[PDB]
Amino acid sequence: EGYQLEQVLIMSRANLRAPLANNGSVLEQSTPKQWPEWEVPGGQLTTKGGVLEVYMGHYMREWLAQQGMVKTGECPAADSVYAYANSLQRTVATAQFFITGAFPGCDVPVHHQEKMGTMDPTFNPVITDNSPEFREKALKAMETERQKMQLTESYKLLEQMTNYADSPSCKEKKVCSLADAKDTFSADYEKEPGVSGPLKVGNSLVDAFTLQYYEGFPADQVAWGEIKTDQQWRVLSKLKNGYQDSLFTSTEVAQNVAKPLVKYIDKTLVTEQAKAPKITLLVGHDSNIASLLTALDFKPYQLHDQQERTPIGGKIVFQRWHDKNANQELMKIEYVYQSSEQLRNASVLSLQSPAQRVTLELKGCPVDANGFCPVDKFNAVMNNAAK
Amino acid sequence: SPEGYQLEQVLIMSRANLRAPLANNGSVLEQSTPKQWPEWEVPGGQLTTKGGVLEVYMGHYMREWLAQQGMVKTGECPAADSVYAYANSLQRTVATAQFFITGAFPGCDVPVHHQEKMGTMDPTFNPVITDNSPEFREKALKAMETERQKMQLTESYKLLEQMTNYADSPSCKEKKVCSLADAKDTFSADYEKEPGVSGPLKVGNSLVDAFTLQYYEGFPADQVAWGEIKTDQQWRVLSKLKNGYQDSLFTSTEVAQNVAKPLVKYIDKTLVTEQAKAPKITLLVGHDSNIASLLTALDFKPYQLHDQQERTPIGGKIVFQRWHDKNANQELMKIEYVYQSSEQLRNASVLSLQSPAQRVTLELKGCPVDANGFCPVDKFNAVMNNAA
Numbered sequence: 001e002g003y004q005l006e007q008v009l010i011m012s013r014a015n016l017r018a019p020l021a022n023n024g025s026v027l028e029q030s031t032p033k034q035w036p037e038w039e040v041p042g043g044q045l046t047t048k049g050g051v052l053e054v055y056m057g058h059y060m061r062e063w064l065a066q067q068g069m070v071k072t073g074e075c076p077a078a079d080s081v082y083a084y085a086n087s088l089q090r091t092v093a094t095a096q097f098f099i100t101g102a103f104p105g106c107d108v109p110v111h112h113q114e115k116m117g118t119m120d121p122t123f124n125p126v127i128t129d130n131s132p133e134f135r136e137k138a139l140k141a142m143e144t145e146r147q148k149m150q151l152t153e154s155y156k157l158l159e160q161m162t163n164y165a166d167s168p169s170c171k172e173k174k175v176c177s178l179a180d181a182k183d184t185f186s187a188d189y190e191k192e193p194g195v196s197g198p199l200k201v202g203n204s205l206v207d208a209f210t211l212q213y214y215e216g217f218p219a220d221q222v223a224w225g226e227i228k229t230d231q232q233w234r235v236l237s238k239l240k241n242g243y244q245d246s247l248f249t250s251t252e253v254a255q256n257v258a259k260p261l262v263k264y265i266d267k268t269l270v271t272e273q274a275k276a277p278k279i280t281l282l283v284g285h286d287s288n289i290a291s292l293l294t295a296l297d298f299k300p301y302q303l304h305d306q307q308e309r310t311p312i313g314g315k316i317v318f319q320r321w322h323d324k325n326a327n328q329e330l331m332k333i334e335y336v337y338q339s340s341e342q343l344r345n346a347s348v349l350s351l352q353s354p355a356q357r358v359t360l361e362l363k364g365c366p367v368d369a370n371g372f373c374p375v376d377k378f379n380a381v382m383n384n385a386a387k
Numbered sequence: 388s389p390e391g392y393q394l395e396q397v398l399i400m401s402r403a404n405l406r407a408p409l410a411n412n413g414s415v416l417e418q419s420t421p422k423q424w425p426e427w428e429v430p431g432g433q434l435t436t437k438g439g440v441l442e443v444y445m446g447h448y449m450r451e452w453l454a455q456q457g458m459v460k461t462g463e464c465p466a467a468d469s470v471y472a473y474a475n476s477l478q479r480t481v482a483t484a485q486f487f488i489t490g491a492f493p494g495c496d497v498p499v500h501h502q503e504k505m506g507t508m509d510p511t512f513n514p515v516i517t518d519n520s521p522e523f524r525e526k527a528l529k530a531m532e533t534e535r536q537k538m539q540l541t542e543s544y545k546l547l548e549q550m551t552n553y554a555d556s557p558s559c560k561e562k563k564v565c566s567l568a569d570a571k572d573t574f575s576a577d578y579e580k581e582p583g584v585s586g587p588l589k590v591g592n593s594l595v596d597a598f599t600l601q602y603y604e605g606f607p608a609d610q611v612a613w614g615e616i617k618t619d620q621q622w623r624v625l626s627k628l629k630n631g632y633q634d635s636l637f638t639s640t641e642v643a644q645n646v647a648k649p650l651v652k653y654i655d656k657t658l659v660t661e662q663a664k665a666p667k668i669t670l671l672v673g674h675d676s677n678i679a680s681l682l683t684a685l686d687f688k689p690y691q692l693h694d695q696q697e698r699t700p701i702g703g704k705i706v707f708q709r710w711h712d713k714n715a716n717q718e719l720m721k722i723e724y725v726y727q728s729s730e731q732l733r734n735a736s737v738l739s740l741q742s743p744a745q746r747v748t749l750e751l752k753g754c755p756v757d758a759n760g761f762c763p764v765d766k767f768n769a770v771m772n773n774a775a
C-alpha cells in the first residue's frame with residue numbers, strides 16, 4: 001500500500017508558562033505598572049498550556065494513525081514511544097501532557113535527567129569552543145545579524161506601553177531608554193550565546209505579552225490593552241524574533257551550540273536506528289529549535305498565522321517513510337503548530353480542523369513536489385552536521 | 388476549614404471521566420431504535436480526549452485546593468512517594484488517573500499504578516459477587532427486587548420509546564417486544580459476576596447512559612438523542628432509568644457489602660489501620676458501581692448532587708479528609724463528593740478556587756458531623772473497622 005510512516009522524531013519546545021514578574025525580575029524592573037497575576041510561579045507551565053498540548057497530542061495521534069503508524073484505539077507496542085524532556089518543570093510538564101493526550105491510558109513514561117531544575121547537556125545550547133577566533137567570529141556574526149534589523153519603531157512603541165522611563169531600571173539603575181541603548185553580545189565559553197541591553201529586555205517584555213495573549217487574558221489585560229492590531233503584534237515581535245535570530249541563528253554559533261541535540265537526532269534516526277522507537281518526542285526550548293534549524297541548514301521558512309518564529313506548542317516533525325526497501329526510504333520534515341488564534345482559543349484540533357503544517361526543506365536534501373527527499377541525502381546531512 | 392484546622396491526609400475515590408458508550412451495549416442500542424447512533428472519536432468504553440481535558444481541570448482544581456489547605460506547596464512537587472495513584476487496569480481508568488495526576492502535579496514524577504494485564508478487571512475495582520452460596524443470592528435477589536420496587540419508571544420508559552421511535556426498532560418490529568413498561572425485569576447475582584438485570588431496565592440504562600455521554604461530550608443539540616430532549620425535566624425523567632439501574636444493582640446493603648469488600652478493605656488500611664505508613668494523598672480510579680457500592684457499604688446518609696442528573700457523576704470523586712483540630716486536640720474526618728456539574732462537563736469549564744468544582748458534604752450514619760461537616764476520627768474508625 002505504498003509509503004507508510006515508519007519512524008518519527010518530534011522536536012518540541014515547552015507550551016504556555018507564567019512570565020517571571022516577581023520583585024527584582026527583569027519584567028518587574030522594566031515598568032512601574034503592575035503585571036496581571038498568573039496561576040503558577042514564573043517559568044512554570046500553566047494548565048492551559050497542558051490542555052493545548054493535550055490537543056496537539058490527540059491531533060498528532062490521529063495524524064500518525066492516518067499515515068499508517070499505529071492505529072487509534074490501541075496502545076502502541078511497549079517501548080514503541082520514547083519521550084525525553086529537558087529536566088525543568090515546564091518541559092517535563094509539556095511532555096506529560098502531550099504524551100497523555102496522544103497515548104492516553106498507555107504506559108509511556110516521560111524520561112529526564114536525574115536532577116530537576118537544571119539544564120540537561122542534551123538541551124543546553126552552550127559554546128563548546130574556547131578559542132578567541134571562535135569568540136571573535138561568533139560576536140561578529142551576532143552583531144552582523146543584529147545590524148540588519150530596524151528596531152527603533154518597536155522600541156519606541158514598547159517604551160510607551162511600559163512607561164519605561166519611570167521603571168525601577170531607570171530610577172535605580174539609570175537604565176532609562178530602550179531605543180537609544182547599546183546591545184552587548186557575548187559568546188562566552190561554556191555559556192549560551194547572549195546579549196544584554198535593550199534587546200534582552202525587549203525580548204522578555206514582548207514574550208510576556210505573547211504569553212498573556214495565548215493564556216486567554218482579556219484584551220484589557222494583555223499589555224494593559226495596548227496591542228490592538230496584528231500590525232502592532234508584528235512590530236513588537238521583531239524584538240522577540242530579533243533576539244532569537246541574533247543569538248541562535250548565525251552559522252558559526254548554531255553548529256557548535258546544537259551539537260548534542262544534532263548527535264541525539266542522528267543516533268535516533270540514523271546510526272542507532274535498529275534500537276530506536278517508532279516515535280521519539282524531545283521537549284526542549286526555543287533556542288534548541290532555532291539553533292537546530294540553523295545547524296542542519298534548512299532553507300528559509302515562514303509560518304503563516306503566527307507571530308513567533310518558533311511558536312509555543314510548535315514542533316519539528318522529522319518523518320522516515322518506508323514502503324519495501326530501506327534504500328528507497330523518504331524523509332519529510334514539517335513544522336506543525338497552532339496558530340496564534342488556535343492557541344488563544346484553545347481550539348480542539350482534529351483531521352477536519354488541523355494544526356497548521358509547513359513543510360521544511362534541508363538545503364542538503366532537496367524535496368520533491370510533496371515535501372519528500374531521499375533518506376540517502378538526509379543521512380549525509382546528519383553525518384556531516386554530527387561531525 | 389475552621390481556625391486552627393489543618394488538613395493532613397486525603398483519599399480521593401474517583402470515577403473515570405468522560406468515555407464513549409460501552410462497547411458491550413452496542414447491540415442493545417442497535418436493537419432499540421431504527422435511528423443512527425452518532426459516532427465517537429474512540430472505541431466504546433475508552434476515555435475521550437475531552438474526558439482528558441475535563442480531568443486535567445479536576446486535577447488542577449484539587450491541586451489548588453490542596454495548596455489552599457497547606458497539603459502541598461504552590462510551585463513545587465510533593466515529596467517522593469507522598470502521592471499514591473492506583474487505577475483499575477482499563478484504558479479509561481488509567482487514562483483518567485494520568486490526566487488527573489498531570490493536571491494536579493504537572494512536571495512531577497508521580498506514577499499511575501495498575502495491575503499489568505490491561506483490559507482485565509483488577510479485583511480491587513471489580514464489583515463482583517464473591518460469594519457462591521445459594522443463600523447469599525436469595526437475600527440479594529430480593530434486596531435488588533425490593534430497591535427496584537421503590538422506583539416508578541413507567542413515564543421514563545414511555546418517554547424513551549417516544550424519543551427513539553422504539554415502535555420501529557428491531558426489538559419491536561422483529562422480536563415483537565413492543566413496550567418497555569409492560570416488560571419485566573430479572574435480576575441476577577452470579578458468582579464472580581457483577582450483580583445484573585436482564586430486561587427493559589438494562590435497555591433504559593444503556594440508552595440513557597449514551598444520551599448523557601453525548602451531552603457531556605458536546606455533540607451538537609440535534610445529535611444528542613437526535614435532538615429529542617428539550618427540557619431539563621425530560622432529562623430528569625430519563626435519568627431515573629440510569630440511576631434506577633445503578634441503585635437496583637449496587638445499592639442494596641446485602642449486595643453492596645459483598646461487592647465493595649476489596650475497596651472497603653483498601654480504604655480501611657490507608658485511612659485507619661496502616662495509616663501511619665500511608666501516603667498523605669491517595670487517588671484510586673475506578674467505576675460508578677464502585678462508588679455506589681462503597682457508599683452503601685459504609686452506610687452513608689442519603690445525598691443530593693446539585694447541578695447533576697447522575698448519582699455518581701462522570702469524573703466525580705469521594706474525597707475523604709483527615710484533619711487535625713490543633714485548638715481542641717482532636718482528629719476529624721470530613722468527606723465530600725467533588726464533581727463537575729452537567730454544564731461544566733459540556734462546556735469544558737476551566738476549574739479553580741475562583742470557579743470551583745461542585746462540592747457536597749457527605750455524612751456517615753456511624754459518624755455524625757458537626758455544623759461544619761466534621762465528625763470524630765474514632766467514630767470514623769469504628770465504621771471503617773466494623774465494615775472491613
Ligand SMILES: O=P(O)(O)O[C@H]1[C@H](OP(=O)(O)O)[C@@H](OP(=O)(O)O)[C@H](OP(=O)(O)O)[C@H](OP(=O)(O)O)[C@H]1OP(=O)(O)O
Binds near residue numbers: 013014088203204288
Ligand atoms: O534554556 P534555553 O534553551 O535558552 O531556553 C529557555 C527559554 O525557552 P522556552 O521559552 O522555549 O522554554 C527562553 O525563552 P525566551 O525568553 O528566549 O522566549 C530563555 O528565556 P527565559 O530566561 O525568559 O526563559 C531561557 O534562556 P537561558 O537558558 O539562557 O536563560 C531558557 O530558560 P531556562 O533558563 O529555564 O532554560
Ligand SMILES: O=P(O)(O)O[C@H]1[C@H](OP(=O)(O)O)[C@@H](OP(=O)(O)O)[C@H](OP(=O)(O)O)[C@H](OP(=O)(O)O)[C@H]1OP(=O)(O)O
Binds near residue numbers: 432
Ligand atoms: O464494569 P465496571 O468495572 O463497572 O466498569 C465499566 C462501567 O463504568 P464507568 O463508566 O464508571 O467506568 C460500567 O457501566 P456504567 O455503570 O458506567 O454504565 C460497567 O457495567 P454496566 O455495563 O453494567 O453499567 C461495565 O462492565 P460490564 O459491561 O462487564 O458489566 C464496565 O465497562 P467495560 O465495558 O469497558 O468493561
Ligand SMILES: [Ca+2]
Binds near residue numbers: 149151
Ligand atoms: Ca536599529
